[PDB]
Amino acid sequence: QENHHVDYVIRFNYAIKKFEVLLLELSEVGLQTEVRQGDENSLFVFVRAASKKKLKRAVYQSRVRDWLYGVRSEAERLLVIYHLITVPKAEGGAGITPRHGEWKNVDAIFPLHDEETNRQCMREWSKKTFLSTEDLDRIRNTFGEHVGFYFAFLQSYFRFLMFPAAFGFSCWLLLGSFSIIYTVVNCLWCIVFIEYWKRQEEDLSCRWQTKGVSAVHEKRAEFKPGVFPATKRMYRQLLQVPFALLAAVALGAIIATCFAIEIFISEVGYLVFIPTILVSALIPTMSAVLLTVATKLNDYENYETQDAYKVALTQKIFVVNFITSYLPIILTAFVYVPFASRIVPYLDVFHLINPDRLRKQVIYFTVTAQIVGFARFLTRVRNEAELEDYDVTDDLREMCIQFGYLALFSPVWPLVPVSFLINNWVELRSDFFKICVECKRPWPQRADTIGPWLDSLGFLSWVGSITSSALVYMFSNTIRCWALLLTIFFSEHLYLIVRYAVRSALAKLEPPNTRRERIERFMMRKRYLDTVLERFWMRQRGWKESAE
Amino acid sequence: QENHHVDYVIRFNYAIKKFEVLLLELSEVGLQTEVRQGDENSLFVFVRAASKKKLKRAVYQSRVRDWLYGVRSEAERLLVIYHLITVPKAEGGAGITPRHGEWKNVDAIFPLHDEETNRQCMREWSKKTFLSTEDLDRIRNTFGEHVGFYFAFLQSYFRFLMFPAAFGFSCWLLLGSFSIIYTVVNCLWCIVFIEYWKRQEEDLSCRWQTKGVSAVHEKRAEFKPGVFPATKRMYRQLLQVPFALLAAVALGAIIATCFAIEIFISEVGYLVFIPTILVSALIPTMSAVLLTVATKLNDYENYETQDAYKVALTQKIFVVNFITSYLPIILTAFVYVPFASRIVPYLDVFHLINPDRLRKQVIYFTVTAQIVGFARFLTRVRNEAELEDYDVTDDLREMCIQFGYLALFSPVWPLVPVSFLINNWVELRSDFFKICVECKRPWPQRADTIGPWLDSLGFLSWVGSITSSALVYMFSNTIRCWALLLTIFFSEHLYLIVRYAVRSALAKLEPPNTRRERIERFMMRKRYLDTVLERFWMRQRGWKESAE
Incomplete structure (x- = not known):
């Protein structure tokens, strides 16, 4: 790809003590980092997922946190990577607020543009006047x-x-x-x-x-x-x-x-x-x-x-x-x-x-x-x-x-x-x-x-x-x-x-699209349900005795 | 007890063909029946649960039908016995509507009063003017x-x-x-x-x-x-x-x-x-x-x-x-x-x-x-x-x-x-x-x-x-x-x-009682969550290399 598999990039403004805690908190959760020179007074930390065994754990934990509140491509992976940086340390990972408390030297975190999709969309919509539902x-x-x-x-x-x-x-x-x-x-x-x-x-x-x-x-x-x-x-x-x-x-x-x-x-x-x-x-x-x-x-x-x-x-x-x-x-x-x-x-x-x-x-x-x-x-x-x-x-x-x-x-x-x-x-x-x-x-x-x-x-x-x-x-x-x-x-x-x-x-x-979700939920419920399924009373013991 | 463990009683108005299908549909689901004489033109069918192994199945099926729609003493047993008589045959059991279609000779089904609780409540509330929350x-x-x-x-x-x-x-x-x-x-x-x-x-x-x-x-x-x-x-x-x-x-x-x-x-x-x-x-x-x-x-x-x-x-x-x-x-x-x-x-x-x-x-x-x-x-x-x-x-x-x-x-x-x-x-x-x-x-x-x-x-x-x-x-x-x-x-x-x-x-x-349910649901969620938990990138392989 034209991007070098970079998921996010963190800008760090400047001493060398607030940098090691940043790299340690990014390496505690599973993320691979690479440091380059910023503009003139900052450093760039490029961040991607470390292995295929940790991205699955991050996706599973984000789905668990979605299912516990009643909610349960590229924009799903970027969402579950962004929730691995800013969500507090008790729930997710590393709790990095951009610049408010204990992280004042972090300026902004942001993803990178993909110019091929932006060029192939701004051209095919330059004369259309109405976007379709697949657009x-x-x-x-x-x-x-x-x-x-x-x-x-x-x-x-x-x-x-x-x-x-x-x-x-x-x-x-x-x-x-x-x-x-x-x-x-x-x-x-x-x-x-x-x-x-x-x-x-x-x-x-x-x-x-x-x-x-x-x-x-x-x-x-x-x-x-x-x-x-x-x-x-x-x-x-x-x-x-x-x-x-x-x-x-x-x-x-x-x-x-x-x-x-x-x-x-x-x-x-x-x-x-x-x-x-x-x-x-x-x-x-x-x-x-x-x-x-x-x-x-x-x-x-x-x-x-x-x-x-x-x-x-x-x-x-x-x-x-x-x-x-x-x-x-x-x-x-x-x-x-x-x-x-x-x-x-x-x-x-x-x-x-x-x-x-x-x-x-x-x-x-x-x-x-x-x-x-x-x-x-x-x-x-x-x-x-x-x-x-x-x-x-x-x-x-x-x-x-x-x-x-x-x-x-x-x-x-x-x-x-x-x-x-x-x-x-x-x-x-x-x-x-x-x-x-x-x-x-x-x-x-x-x-x-x-x-x-x-x-x-x-x-x-x-x-x-x-x-x-x-x-x-x-x-x-x-x-x-x-x-x-x-x-x-x-x-x-x-x-x-x-x-x-x-x-x-x-x-x-x-x-x-409301009828399709209604039919799917009804079918799931009706598929789960069918897999599940003293001398007064001793006078007529049995079924056929009561009818006689 | 003063009632003879009778859960429900069915009144059947009157020939002998609509009675055997009633007794068969009541005996298909697990219910014990006993037939006595009604007033002058009817019969009484007393109905209770047949065994302790079937009441548990009825309670479990009613809880499954409650949990599948987002909802999940004496008045719980009577509810799960009443749902074993009238709920349609695909979901629960026996589908007995009182008198509208294929059951025209059934007049009414009803439970029996308990006179001891009614006497011990109408006496202790005869001079109170305000019912407590345990009342x-x-x-x-x-x-x-x-x-x-x-x-x-x-x-x-x-x-x-x-x-x-x-x-x-x-x-x-x-x-x-x-x-x-x-x-x-x-x-x-x-x-x-x-x-x-x-x-x-x-x-x-x-x-x-x-x-x-x-x-x-x-x-x-x-x-x-x-x-x-x-x-x-x-x-x-x-x-x-x-x-x-x-x-x-x-x-x-x-x-x-x-x-x-x-x-x-x-x-x-x-x-x-x-x-x-x-x-x-x-x-x-x-x-x-x-x-x-x-x-x-x-x-x-x-x-x-x-x-x-x-x-x-x-x-x-x-x-x-x-x-x-x-x-x-x-x-x-x-x-x-x-x-x-x-x-x-x-x-x-x-x-x-x-x-x-x-x-x-x-x-x-x-x-x-x-x-x-x-x-x-x-x-x-x-x-x-x-x-x-x-x-x-x-x-x-x-x-x-x-x-x-x-x-x-x-x-x-x-x-x-x-x-x-x-x-x-x-x-x-x-x-x-x-x-x-x-x-x-x-x-x-x-x-x-x-x-x-x-x-x-x-x-x-x-x-x-x-x-x-x-x-x-x-x-x-x-x-x-x-x-x-x-x-x-x-x-x-x-x-x-x-x-x-x-x-x-x-x-x-x-x-x-809203705060107690909120605290209990929050504690259940936070108890379930803590039990769950290419030459560009080969330049600084490791954590301590990036900080140096």
Whole structure:
């Protein structure tokens, strides 16, 4: 092979006492090592399995640890070799955390790329537009299941987006804006997509046998106690509400400043809405500053398990997304357009608004940022050791933003899904090229779900049936506030019924890899079972005596 | 023993050909039989285990069938003997359905009472007022777990009812009717009781090892195909909406007739509201006629499994309970009192209403029906074979009615919980005396939950936060309809948040029999695990060569 059978490579930063304990702990478990020179201040330890008699023991111990928790190619061997380095010494072997405690001089451990499979996949998918189900299994036998779930989800979202893009173009030549047919169909689409993906997840976790790995909770190495009381965390978790209430006011001031400068320009053609465009093209910069504060606040709260840090980070990213993406449109649909006679004499300092202003705001906030934003072995190992590290959490955030724009403010302008579909099609195979050229290879982490991002998509539908049903009343064709509060009531309690009726009609249809596992488990059980198989009573002793 | 080691007794109604196949199928599996004369047209077949070598085989086969589905005293032996008679011939033995197909001449099979334990329990509990946790385990080692769950639930409900009874008496000497403090506290009590019982169920199913028996689905013998298409059932399931819409109109006509006769009596002291009292004391009679129609409609829909017939019957009983119990008070709180100037000149035929009429309606509907409604072996076997059969589904229906009155209409009159607590205390040990004197003994059926009745109690809280927050606005101190529809919105969406905050604070507190099973499973796993445990690479062959 082009790699020299190297399973992993460990980078050790620099004295010669922390190196011998590393080599001893790697040689205690069965691993063969080889030491070479790093870049300029480090050493490289290449690690593979020592013999064929120890790889079988490692595979058997990992299967025992899987079977004891209810869970029971290249990406299986790399997984059972990675569990021989980092799993603690009582359970598995050598317990090497990367750099937190007693291992501060280890920088990172990482596997090596295989350029032949990456070249023979990026060529055969350069013009295909839709990956087959035998193509998703090659983004699983390399990179594991945590990457395959993400790629399958993005392809299913692109396949479902073609219906609002083709229905909102026909609801723009024939019906216009603020329609009831488009609002009802768009609200049903958001229910059907989520309830369809929730069973595609069970299908895909029955196909790739990772059915119950969500309950095996890992433990963070950056936890600092060991026990930490659950009330000292519930007081550090209250620094989120002044952060949210301060960010909301700091954005409302900027949006009111744009509303004042547009009035001052309009008093003294298309250059009137320049202070809105220059704010709408600058939100991905001012939303990447609040995420660093959210990350510092999430690291301050001192979580113990790894599957709680991710839920806290997702919940903190959702609030920043809401504040910086949907508050500039909520503040001009419910506060500024229906109250434009008690606000405009206040915002017109140095004294000198139809519902089309809302349509122009939706156009400028879902288009502008997209238009603006468009020997030989030891050398390549040193090149691969200097690349960045990949994550899927920066590409599902943009998907959640797009889904919120579809669920909330789509009746205002029905060419929002066409504008999202064109942008999704231009950069289709761009995150694959990112993951096998300009990043380093991730260890084959297993997964069961795309994560807690599926719980933020169900919130944004419930809000949408309120918001998109208070616009169709307010701006189609005197507001008459009781009819608005009756429309909101009946729309929300009809959403809650249609979601129940859709959720229980998709539970009867079984996908083809759940039926195969059900038949196999039934056959195993019914094959195991058939291999297994005082003077009152002395009156009728025998069978034929009782019948006589 | 006083019983002659009789495990079961089978009643066979009458020619002599259907008897020999019964005795042969009972003797194929290992069971000793003895035949005696029945009452006047039947025979009695007494059945016990044949030897000590076959009871062990039956216990082992029942444990194998439990372990293959994830589940793994007197009430264990009776359970494994009952599974040797009715379980189909491919899995267990002899497949005797009581009377549906090929066994039409078998009337019933039933075990015998033990009068010594029933006498020594009904005496030691005749003055105790609260059963200990070593007393619920004697209503489990006899009668099984399906009866013990019911008795534990009723005792927990009686223990929680003492707080609204003591708080609504203090909100009647000091604050009166239609209060905000009483409405908020009463709405929080209904959340805390349900979320507390939902973890007491997990505690009790970890104590009595029946943790996962809800997934083992049984099969109805009255199913008539074998397959039945799932769309011929979904058209028979649409005969429920004309039944409901006809029962509602047939009750609204009667309530309007009472409203007319009260006006006609009042025109021409306490005898004015006689046509309401005589309707409020007659609802348990006219609600036992609609349940027979609901039972016929539920048997017409042809369900296959036993755990779907029960959910359909509970859902059909809930609608009849709603229509006949809360519609006479909804029709006089939202239709008749605020519109008493456009209705009273219509209901006053032969021409000749404060908010205290609503208080009198709640008084007459939660009090009146309660005040108005207050040798030697072969002889006792023939006496026990003529008693009725017991069920727990006629005593949880009255509990669900009482909980709906507490959740919905309690701010109108705060002596509703005192009136329920007095009635619950007068007849405390009355369903135990019913189950061991005037019924026959049930076979020890296992259980995991009280059933789908816990899903009707969560609906009645969600409705209550609407209803009990539209009365406090409407009748305390011009209705001003936008303020009513704003009160309903904020009350419902505050209920949905407080229920989430209570549900996730009770998940951290673990009851003492869940921790013991967690520690035991952890110790078993950590006891099983510790018993288990090319010129590039030939440069540094060995451990100490790499460190040098």
